[PDB]
Amino acid sequence: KGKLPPGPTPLPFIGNYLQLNTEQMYNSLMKISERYGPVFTIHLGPRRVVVLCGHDAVREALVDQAEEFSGRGEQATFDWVFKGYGVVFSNGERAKQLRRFSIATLRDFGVGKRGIEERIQEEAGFLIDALRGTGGANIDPTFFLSRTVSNVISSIVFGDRFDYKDKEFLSLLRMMLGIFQFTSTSTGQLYEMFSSVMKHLPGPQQQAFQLLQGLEDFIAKKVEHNQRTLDPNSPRDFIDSFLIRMQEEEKNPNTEFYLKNLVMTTLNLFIGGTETVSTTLRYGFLLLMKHPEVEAKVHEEIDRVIGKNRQPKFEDRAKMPYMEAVIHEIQRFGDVIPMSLARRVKKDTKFRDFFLPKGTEVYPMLGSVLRDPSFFSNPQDFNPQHFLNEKGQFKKSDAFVPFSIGKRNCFGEGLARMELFLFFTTVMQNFRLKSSQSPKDIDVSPKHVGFATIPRNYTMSFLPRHH
Ligand code: HEM
Ligand SMILES: COc1c2occc2cc2ccc(=O)oc12
């Protein structure tokens, strides 16, 4: 039947709000799924959204009907600053043009090649110095990890890294951490439903907007400088490249290459290339302290394959199935972006005997794919075996979708995977982790779950490995 997926009856404007717990959107949605099935319709305030739970529904839509589900839906807190500009939250021609250019420009600046691998290895060296600098003292690893991660994408988009002592750099990192935290709280999820009123009201969301505003202001300041020092012949970074394409297109009235898309696209990458990787690393170390046996096996593999002298290199991954399994399990357990970024159908679509009118938003519940009990034996526990066969070799999974899938999937996945492996490996090779508390008492449940999955605050010490 040409019918929209089934779902609970919505009330005018508020939608299904009375049937949802904004502090736990994910659980609220999965519960509703228990009654209506894997594919259902929900009304987040006035926003009608088709929810996709489980591997099959998600893959069937985003991959089997990729083009139809390739539209970009909204994320209200982020659209407040982006407003449809830039590569992430853009649609149609704007997105195709910005995405093609971004992927190309990233590769031209080392992504995938030896260039960025070297940059990551150097930055990891700096992270190691910094952790040695704590003298084994108990610390909050949060900004040690974010400063390192950020410098990778920062050297690509800005021309070079930030000094670890640059206070403005810490400030930008605080803004990123804060925005991801806000969109993961109940107020952030309430904003997803009622932004029409809430953006004009006092409250936590206003402080969230200022963080985005500070990030935009910073990007706009970096662009100006690049502009007044640009060598049309020798671009220094992503910004230069984009400024050059802008000049080339100065004659195309319909060009997507203009200042606003440069500021928004660069901001997209600065944030995207920072907080996601940083949050995964942070959750990862907490999971390893909770499971010493896994850290032990990681240490075994690192000592055999890499040893204690040379810097780990990306190709080492081919020889380390356990480590590769652990990183996969960390991303699977962490479920950093539990509901992906909303997609939307480009045109009237037919999906599993259901009807989805053009423009309909879609929520691919990645978290439900990473925990599909039909793909992982103990979906609720942290267990690397989930990514190993009986002979202890690495085993892929069609349900491993932390980067989502399809036409608007994460094109930073390559950089991210290189970062996760090189940082997790280089740190583990140099230190054993010591929990400020007892393994049995470490809580790995998340502190917040909304747009992102935020792990609980913790402290730890990095103890060197020598004797
Ligand atoms: C552990 C790290 C990361 C995770 C879990 C992650 C996750 C995701 C997800 C789930 C999406 C939405 C995909 C979709 O619509 O289907 C996405 C989008 C995107 N990611 Fe990542 N990401 C990570 C790191 C990166 C990095 C390092 C960069 C930057 C180079 C980045 C750049 C982007 C961009 C530009 C998009 C938007 C793509 C588009 O709309 O066409 N991501 N990411
Ligand atoms: C481009 O990278 C990303 C992301 O990647 C994965 C999640 C995610 C969220 C944002 C939000 C704002 C932004 O500017 O960028 C983002």
Side-chain angles (χ1 to χ4, degrees), residues 81 167 271:
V81 72
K167 295 189 169 191
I271 294 174

Side-chain angles (χ1 to χ4, degrees), residues 78 82 88-89 267-268 271-272 276 337 341 451:
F78 296 110
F82 298 124
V88 176
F89 303 97
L267 178 47
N268 280 160
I271 294 174
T276 52
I337 309 291
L341 264 51
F451 167 71

Side-chain angles (χ1 to χ4, degrees), residues 177-205:
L177 179 63
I179 294 163
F180 257 52
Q181 205 131 49
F182 173 77
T183 57
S184 292
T185 62
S186 57
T187 306
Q189 283 306 98
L190 181 69
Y191 188 76
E192 287 310 297
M193 301 182 205
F194 305 113
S195 54
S196 53
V197 176
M198 286 176 77
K199 70 176 74 157
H200 305 299
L201 302 180
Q205 64 276 23

Side-chain angles (χ1 to χ4, degrees), residues 72 88 99 272-273 276 280 331 343 402-404 408 410-412:
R72 169 103 288 148
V88 176
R99 176 164 168 129
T276 52
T280 306
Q331 293 199 265
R343 292 295 192 78
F403 296 98
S404 187
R408 288 296 291 272
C410 176
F411 64 79

Side-chain angles (χ1 to χ4, degrees), residues 28-40:
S28 291
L29 292 172
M30 289 305 102
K31 179 167 179 177
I32 292 181
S33 183
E34 294 173 11
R35 170 168 174 185
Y36 294 84
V39 182
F40 66 98

